[PDB]
Each structure stands twice: as C-alpha cells, then as structure tokens.
Amino acid sequence: GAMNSSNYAELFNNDIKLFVDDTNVYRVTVHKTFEGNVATKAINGCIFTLNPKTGHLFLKIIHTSVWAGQKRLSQLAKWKTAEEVSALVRSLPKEEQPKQIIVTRKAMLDPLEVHMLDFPNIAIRPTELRLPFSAAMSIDKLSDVVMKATEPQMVLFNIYDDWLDRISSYTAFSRLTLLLRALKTNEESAKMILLSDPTITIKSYHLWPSFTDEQWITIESQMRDLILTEYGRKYNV
Amino acid sequence: MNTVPFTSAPIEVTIGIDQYSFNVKENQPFHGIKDIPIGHVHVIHFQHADNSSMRYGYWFDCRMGNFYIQYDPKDGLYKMMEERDGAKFENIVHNFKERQMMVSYPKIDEDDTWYNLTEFVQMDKIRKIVRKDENQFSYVDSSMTTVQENELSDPAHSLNYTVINFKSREAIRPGHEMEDFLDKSYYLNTVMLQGIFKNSSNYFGELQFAFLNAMFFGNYGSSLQWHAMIELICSSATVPKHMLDKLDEILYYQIKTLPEQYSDILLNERVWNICLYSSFQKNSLHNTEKIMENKYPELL
C-alpha cells in the first residue's frame, strides 16, 4: 500500500519502481494588472520522475504553451503529469517498465491510475513520506534546462552523478534527500555550503560537486546542522 | 387481486410483504396473504425469531403463476413453490379464505409507495440477475454476493448486476482520459444507456431492484450497486432531462421508505454529498435534496 518509514528499504530491492513528483509541473508568478487585479504568469515546469535505485532521472520539461487556452490548470497539470508518465512507460522496453510507480502527492493517484489502465500489473502507490523533490529546481543545472527550453522536451540525468561507484543506493538516496531537504529549507545557505570552496567543481556531466569521501562527510554534517537550525528558528525551540 | 397461501407456519418468524410485515408465532394457524395487487412485482420475505441475521425472500409476479409457501424442515426455511394444477390451487385458497386464516395485503389507497419503488422493476429483468430459471420467482438473501464482488465465489448464487467501474477501459476512452473521468456522460449514455441497458427504464429498474435488496435484506452488495448507479448519473454533465426528473422521484421515495435507524450503513456519505452538492446534478434533485436535509441532516 502506502510507502512510509516501515517499508523504506523496498525502494532499493531489484523491482524497478519510479517516484513521480508533480510539484513543479504548473509554476506561476503572481503579479498585478494595470487595473489593479491579480493575474498569474506561468513559467516552464518539469515532471520529476526518478528511479531511486539507479539514479536515473527522467526530467520531462513542461512548456508554457501546454496551458495556452486552458482552464483549471492546477487540475489539468495533474492529468498532463499522468499522460506524460504513461507515455514514458509505454516508450520503455518491457523489461525496463516499472512494477510500481510511487506518487509523491495523493492527488495524482486517480489521474495516473486512469492513464495506466493499459498496465494493470503496474501498481500506483501513494506515500506517507515527506520527500523534498520540490527543491529539484534549486539544483542549478535542472532549473537552467527547464527555464531555457522552447518546446516540450525530455532530459535524462543521473541525480546521483557517479556516487554509486563508491556507495549503495540506500546511502545515495539519503544523501540526495538530505541535500534537497536542506535546499528546501534554506536555499541560500544550502547553496553557500555546496559551492563555498571554488576548488571543488562540478563536472560538465554532473549535477553536484566532485567531493571526496572525506569531503562528503563535512558536507552532510553541515546540511544536517542547517536543517536543525532552521527548525529551531521556525518553532522557537 | 391474487393470493399466496402458506401450507403452514412451523416456526416463529416475521413475515414481510413488500413494505409491510407481521409477526407469526410458532404453529400459529397462518395460511397466507390475500388481496395482493396484480400489476406489480412483489417480494415476500422472512426473518426467523431465532436467527435475526439472514433475512431472505422471494421476488415474484402473480401474473406468472400460482405461488405458495411451504416450510422445509431439512433446509430450515420457508420456500416459495409453484402449483401447476389450476383447480387444486383455487381450492386450497378458497378454503383458507373461507376459514379466514389469511391476512389481507393492507394497502391504503392514497398510497402509491409500492408503485413508486417498483415502477421500473420487471420480473424478467430480475431473473437475469438471479439466474435460476427452473423457478418463475427469485430467491434473495442477506448473504448473497454480486458478480463484481466475486472478481475481488459460487456463481450459482450470484447477483448478476451490471458491472460499473469508473476506472476501467469500458468507462474511459483512450485519449479522453481526463474528460471521461470527470464527465461520465460517455460511459452513461453510450456505453450504459444505449449499449447495455438499451433504455433508461431498465437502468432505473436495476437501480430500484438494487435499493430494495439492500433495504429488505441489508444485502451489502446491492447497496453498492444502487449507489454506483446513482453516482454515474450525478457524475454526468449531460443527462436526458426526463431521466433527471424521474431520478429525483425514484430517490425521494427510496429515502422516504428507508428505516430511520439504518441510515448509517445503507447511505454512502460520499456519494450523496457528491450527488447533491458537488455533482453536475446538484441542482436537479430538489425533492431528494429536501427530504435528505430535513430527515438526515447529520449525514451531510
């Protein structure tokens, strides 16, 4: 059923599964009109579809044109998400199609379920975890390729860079969500922490810096410390 | 006016006939029910004084034969049987009514309640849901399952209701995924009305049969079927105007006849709030809305 802290290591067995995060699909800025009314301006968005075992990110860029002449956009965004996930699945060779898709937001269950009707043997599941995939657009390279795009377009990434060459999926996934947790709670500072030292760079084909094993420890500890500082501040603890 | 005689009454049981019912004591001289209106379907039903669970009953139509009730002590229930001998049947009936051991079907003549609950129920359509074609009447009880419940086990005893499923290929045209699942009009009008039921009257008849099985036997699968048939209409932006006005009458009389104390298991909170206040058809169930509010404001 629902994914939570109990059935957490399932993400790392050898059943193909993907997470689908729909939070950055329909993005707007809110502004005032000449007459003083409020209006929205949509910007480009992205479906965040991630295999947590391998790091394979299928970033489906959502061009603002898709909304042109449409009503109930936040509702439509959910259906376009499911249409695009289904199309991803159909495009994958059978042996690669996922056996589970885990939506990060319960509202996506019914659109996905309806779009996946041709794949009855793929289970659509909710989750009770509080995953931080909305901060995907705080990763500079993902935000850049989304914002530059001029047409619908899919871009493949590995969100783990080359970490799996030295650590396990479980660990990889925890580093990732820790880094994104920090990025969600205080982007300025999280980014400060990653980029302070100009001598540790990001490879042209990577998303994150090329930290050594020792350096990843200092980083994870600074991420941790930031997150607990920000919680104290929010609640006065 | 037709009659259903009872050979005997060996055990203490509560007998029901349509929306009427009587207590009959063990070996009370009770020999049947007289003055049953020809022209509608009827249902006679039983709840033993010992076993308050399993309510069970027979759906029938007098035009289709001479029917009677005999207790079977091996199987331990009142059974409906057909007497094929014309003469021998009028002979038992005349004797018992001359002996006056029979209760009269107690119809107030202002009351169109039974007619309103059964308007679209045809006996022929009943025998396609309770398939047992050696009998002109149909047996239902509290415990029978539906075909859709059997997909998620003995098919002889199945209630073969029409399968409705909002998340199915039948309901959702490829490419109109979003549109069909927010606006079920397609699924209602083309697939169900024009495809399977052929007309709104058979639709309504199953809907109404389903309600009555839920009410008289607390058949939980009938309750599901009834709500599904309601949700499908209320979730459809485009419905024949005649069907909307009939549905408001149908529901009015169902909600009116329901026992007040059973409103908790027989009425699905989500469906009813969706139909009355969220659906396309919120504004089209004026009678049903008004009764629901004044009688069961809690559920909403």
Swiss-Prot record, chain A:
Q: Where in the cell is it found?
A: Nucleus
Q: Which domain of life is it from?
A: Eukaryota
Impact upon substituting residue 22 to A? Reduced growth at 30 degrees Celsius. Strongly reduced growth at 16 degrees Celsius. Strongly reduced growth at 35 degrees Celsius
Q: Where are the residues of the annotated region RNase H homology domain?
A: 7-237
What does UniProt say about this protein's domains?
The MPN (JAB/Mov34) domain has structural similarity with deubiquitinating enzymes, but lacks the residues that would bind the catalytic metal ion.
Q: What does this protein do?
A: Functions as a scaffold that mediates the ordered assembly of spliceosomal proteins and snRNAs. Required for association of BRR2 with the spliceosomal U5 snRNP, and the subsequent assembly of the U4/U6-U5 tri-snRNP complex. Functions as a scaffold that positions spliceosomal U2, U5 and U6 snRNAs at splice sites on pre-mRNA substrates, so that splicing can occur. Interacts with both the 5' and the 3' splice site, as well as the branch region. Has a role in branch site-3' splice site selection. Associates with the branch site-3' splice 3'-exon region. Also has a role in cell cycle.
* Extra remark beyond the main annotation: Present with 468 molecules/cell in log phase SD medium.
Q: How does it assemble?
A: Component of the U4/U6-U5 tri-snRNP complex composed of the U4, U6 and U5 snRNAs and at least PRP3, PRP4, PRP6, PRP8, PRP18, PRP31, PRP38, SNU13, SNU23, SNU66, SNU114, SPP381, SMB1, SMD1, SMD2, SMD3, SMX2, SMX3, LSM2, LSM3, LSM4, LSM5, LSM6, LSM7, LSM8, BRR2 and DIB1.
Protein's UniProt name: Pre-mRNA-splicing factor 8
From Swiss-Prot, chain B:
Name its GO BP terms in alphabetical order: spliceosomal snRNP assembly; spliceosomal tri-snRNP complex assembly
Q: What functional role does this protein have?
A: Component of the U5 snRNP complex that is required for spliceosome assembly and for pre-mRNA splicing. Involved in splicing pre-mRNA of the A1 cistron and other genes that are important for cell growth.
Q: What InterPro entries does the annotation carry?
A: AAR2, AAR2_C, AAR2_C_sf, Aar2_N, AAR2_N_sf
Keywords per UniProt: Cytoplasm, mRNA processing, mRNA splicing, Nucleus, Phosphoprotein
**Would I find Transferase among this entry's keywords?**
no
Q: List the disulfide bonds.
A: none
Mutating residue 236 to D/E: what's the consequence?
A: Disrupts interaction with PRP8
Which subcellular locations apply to this protein? Cytoplasm; Nucleus
Write down what this protein is called.
A1 cistron-splicing factor AAR2
Identify one Gene Ontology CC term for this UniProt entry: U5 snRNP
Subunit structure and binding partners: Heterodimer. Interacts with PRP8 (via RNase H homology domain and MPN domain), competing with BRR2 for the same binding site. Component of a U5 snRNP complex that contains at least the U5 snRNA, PRP8, SNU114, AAR2, SMB1, SMD1, SMD2, SMD3, SME1, SMX2 and SMX3, but is not a component of the U4/U6-U5 tri-snRNP complex.
Q: Give residue numbers for the modification (Phosphoserine).
A: 236
Q: Which Pfam families match?
A: AAR2, AAR2_1st
- What PTMs does it carry? Phosphorylated on serine and tyrosine residues.
Q: What is its main location?
A: cytoplasm
Q: Which residues carry this modification: Phosphothreonine?
A: 257
Where is the stretch described as Leucine-zipper? 244-265
Anything else the record notes? Present with 7330 molecules/cell in log phase SD medium.
State the similarity comment. Answer: Belongs to the AAR2 family.
